[PDB]
């Protein structure tokens, strides 16, 4: 069912229920639970991590993943192995770092070519995309998170694919990655439980933006002062979000696009419905992330079309699906909170200045040092202007 | 059963089920739940916090702890008192601070003697240990967290003991604190549920390190550029962790030890098994943290020996044990996450610059001020080189 091989050489299949999860740009991940048996013994007693799993979904979808977590429990006179795994087109990026500090202006192809140095994978952009400047390179950082920053600046979304060729993974970078899908949904036919959530606690009608003042000014608001607003503003009225304070961008064409993007990203709609697969009927609905879909729930006020952003498959044996879960538009309110928490908890404990007993000594020492050197610089300025 | 006394004078016993927890270096803690009775009335209605608890484990283990939390619930025509407590060889450290900012080079005995000033407790190192330099003292900080930093630099582990003498607590500082233990374990005899967890999401085969460049350079990689790797690398291959960027260490002998320590700390194995005490048989297995133990689970592929890192006792009455829980090697995956979260949540809210509505004003103001003073300094440099 599931062909797993060491990092050197031959394969071996095992039957086990799988739980895969795929997002548009975020890392995909799977999980499963092997158990000891008369079969599987030679494997289960001999798996070391970074075992290479593949041939999920049968004799197709040869998307090769790698295990990183390994649990081993004892049940009766046998033993379980829960385990986790991640993509090679993502892990292979988490392999390598870059030490040369990228800095300055950077066109997109140059940037996403220097980071694909030695990995072997390939990138390509579809539409014309502008260029910007990256302040400090991640000398002690992965290729992955610099890929994150690059997507945040230039290519707002992406999609990988195992091309026909061996050891190749084309990264189609694109804003708002999508493909049409023939299938569809409705409350009656494929949508058991439709949770429509409309979160708006950080939302906006008009908004201000400042983005060409030099690095040393910070508020003497030169640099394309403007405020924009969306169409819905006129009935809701005067509100506004955190203005686009940070910016070294010259033109005004940018200052409206980024600004309206700051607006329309905030009136959030997460549809964490549930999907239930029909095999004997409607088989042509294998959900895949980053596709278009036309949902329609009667008695809800809903017929529009949306895009998948999260999908969650399970597959017991023979790669037959049991159920699906999906989320549309924004991935969740939930997962946004959880990522916020985990980012806080990992950014912290990666630092070293933290001292829980009276913190801010490390920050206040720094800030007072800064103001003191500024005072000394003032003295130097006066003393030099004297001469 | 449990002799508790005010901070001034006489004792009073109470019977109550206790839940103790002991780690190697981390603070131990206990918890228990007294209830109103015809007995215990004079006490329970008259406990104030920092009541001094002792004589746990009977007429032995006179490890005197102190209460800091006090809950009081109403059950029927009676009342409960849940409560928590902590060690005096740790709380007595959380008592006192140091205001003189320790700074500069520091030999270990000097450092761990200036911090034991007025506490009365005693420290000693067993093996020869090098010395380093501490950048800023914790003028507004506990003796405890400076003890933490000191252990992080020089003495990578420790172990306290109530010596025979009164009001004395010897801190045997040591790397990898351990003592042999005659007892042992196996799946059949003492290990009900063996959860072996092998976490590797931040792991390494080779690794780079930079540690003698001066404070003002930050990447012009002078200072013992090197990359090392472990023995298992050759089959897993090219990966690497966050390089040892931060460092003011001259020699190369250090740069391999610390580096391989960064490696081998990361392929993590947490064995959060469960222990069940046999009283009529096998009584000589009172588990204590920071000891060696030889586990062996058949049908698992396991006969090696490990060390305890966490233990969790309970004792109903007459100081008879009911069950034990323990964790081996690294204390958990779980508790690492939870400590990460709580460190984030307490480091935050100890600060004052935080403003949830558009943060980064406090950081960007600072950074732009820094670049502006650097620009002014450039002007001064040019204007002085003129003269």
């Amino acid at each position: 069912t599931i062909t797993i091989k060491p990092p050197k050489g031959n394969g071996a299949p095992v039957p086990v229920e799988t739980t895969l999860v795929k997002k548009v740009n975020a890392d995909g991940v799977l999980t499963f639970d092997i158990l000891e048996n008369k079969y599987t013994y030679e494997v289960i007693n001999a798996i070391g991590k970074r075992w290479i799993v593949s041939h999920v979904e049968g004799e197709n979808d040869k998307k090769e993943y790698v295990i990183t977590v390994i649990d081993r429990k004892s049940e009766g006179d046998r033993q379980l192995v829960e385990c986790t795994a991640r993509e090679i087109p993502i892990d292979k990026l988490m392999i390598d770092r870059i030490y040369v500090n990228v800095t300055g202006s950077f066109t997109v192809e140059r940037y996403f070519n220097i980071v694909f140095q030695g990995t072997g994978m390939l990138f390509e952009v579809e539409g014309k995309v502008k260029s910007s400047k990256f302040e400090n390179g991640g000398e002690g950082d992965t290729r992955l998170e610099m890929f994150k920053k690059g997507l945040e600046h230039f290519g707002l979304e992406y999609k990988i694919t195992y091309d026909k060729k061996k050891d190749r993974y084309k990264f189609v970078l694109t804003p708002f990655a999508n493909q049409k899908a023939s299938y569809f949904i409705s409350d009656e036919v494929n949508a058991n439980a439709i949770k429509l959530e409309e979160d708006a606690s950080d939302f906006a009608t008009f908004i201000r933006g400042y983005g060409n003042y030099s690095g040393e000014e910070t508020f003497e608001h030169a640099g394309l002062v403007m405020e924009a607003r969306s169409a819905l503003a006129e009935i809701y009225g005067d509100i506004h979000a955190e203005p686009f304070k940070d910016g070294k961008v010259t033109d005004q064409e940018t200052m409206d696009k980024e600004l309206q993007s700051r607006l329309k990203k905030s009136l959030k709609q997460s549809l964490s419905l549930d999907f239930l697969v029909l095999r004997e009927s409607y088989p042509e609905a294998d959900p895949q992330p980053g596709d278009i879909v036309q949902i329609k729930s009667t008695k809800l006020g809903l017929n529009d079309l949306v895009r998948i952003v999260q999908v969650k498959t399970i597959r017991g044996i023979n790669n037959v699906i049991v159920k699906q879960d999906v989320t549309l538009g924004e991935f969740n309110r939930e997962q946004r909170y959880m990522k916020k928490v985990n980012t806080a908890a990992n950014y912290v404990s990666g630092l070293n200045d933290v001292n829980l007993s009276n913190p801010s000594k490390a920050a206040e020492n720094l800030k007072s040092k800064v103001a003191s050197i500024a005072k000394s610089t003032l003295d130097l300025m006066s003393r030099t202007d004297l001469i | 059963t449990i002799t508790i006394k005010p901070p001034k004078g006489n004792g009073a016993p109470v019977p109550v089920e206790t839940t103790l927890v002991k780690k190697v270096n981390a603070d131990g803690v206990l918890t228990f739940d007294i209830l109103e009775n015809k007995y215990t009335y004079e006490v329970i209605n008259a406990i104030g916090k920092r009541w001094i608890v002792s004589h746990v484990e009977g007429e032995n283990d006179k490890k005197e702890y102190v209460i800091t939390v006090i809950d009081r619930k109403s059950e029927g025509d009676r009342q409960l008192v849940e409560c928590t407590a902590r060690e005096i060889p740790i709380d007595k450290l959380m008592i006192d601070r140091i205001y003189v900012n320790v700074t500069g080079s520091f030999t270990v005995e000097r450092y761990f003697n200036i911090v034991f000033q007025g506490t009365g407790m005693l420290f000693e190192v067993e093996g020869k240990v090098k010395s380093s330099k501490f950048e800023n003292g914790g003028e507004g900080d506990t003796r405890l967290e400076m003890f933490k930093k000191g252990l992080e630099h020089f003495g990578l582990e420790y172990k306290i003991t109530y010596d025979k003498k009164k009001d004395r607590y010897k801190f045997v500082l040591t790397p990898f604190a351990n003592q042999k233990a005659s007892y042992f374990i196996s799946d059949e005899v003492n290990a009900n549920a063996i959860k072996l967890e092998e976490d590797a999401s931040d792991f390494a085969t080779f690794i780079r390190g930079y540690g003698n460049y001066s404070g003002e350079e930050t990447f012009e990689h002078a200072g013992l550029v090197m990359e090392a790797r472990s023995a298992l690398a050759e089959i897993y291959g090219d990966i690497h962790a966050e390089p040892f960027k931060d460092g003011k260490v001259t020699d190369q002998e250090t740069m391999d030890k610390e580096l391989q320590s960064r490696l081998k700390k990361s392929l993590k194995q947490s064995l959060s098994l469960d222990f069940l005490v046999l009283r009529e048989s096998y009584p000589e297995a009172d588990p204590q943290p920071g000891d060696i133990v030889q586990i062996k689970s058949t049908k698992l592929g396991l006969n090696d020996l490990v060390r305890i890192v966490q233990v969790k006792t309970i004792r109903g009455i007459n100081n008879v044990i009911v069950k034990q829980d323990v964790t081996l090697g690294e204390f958990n995956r779980e508790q690492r996450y939870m400590k990460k979260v709580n460190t984030a949540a307490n480091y935050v809210s100890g600060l004052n610059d935080v403003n949830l509505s558009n943060p980064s004003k406090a950081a960007e103001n600072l950074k732009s001020k820094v670049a502006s003073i650097a620009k002014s300094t450039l002007d001064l440099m040019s204007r002085t080189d003129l003269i």
Binding site: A26, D27, T84, L144, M338 | D199, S201, E334
Partner: peptide
């Protein structure tokens, strides 16, 4: 009392592969 551990354990599981 028994319950906090299961949720926190699944949370730490989720901390694996949550980030690009």
């Amino acid at each position: 009392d028994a319950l906090t551990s299961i949720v926190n354990g699944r949370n730490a599981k989720r901390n694996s592969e949550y980030y690009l």
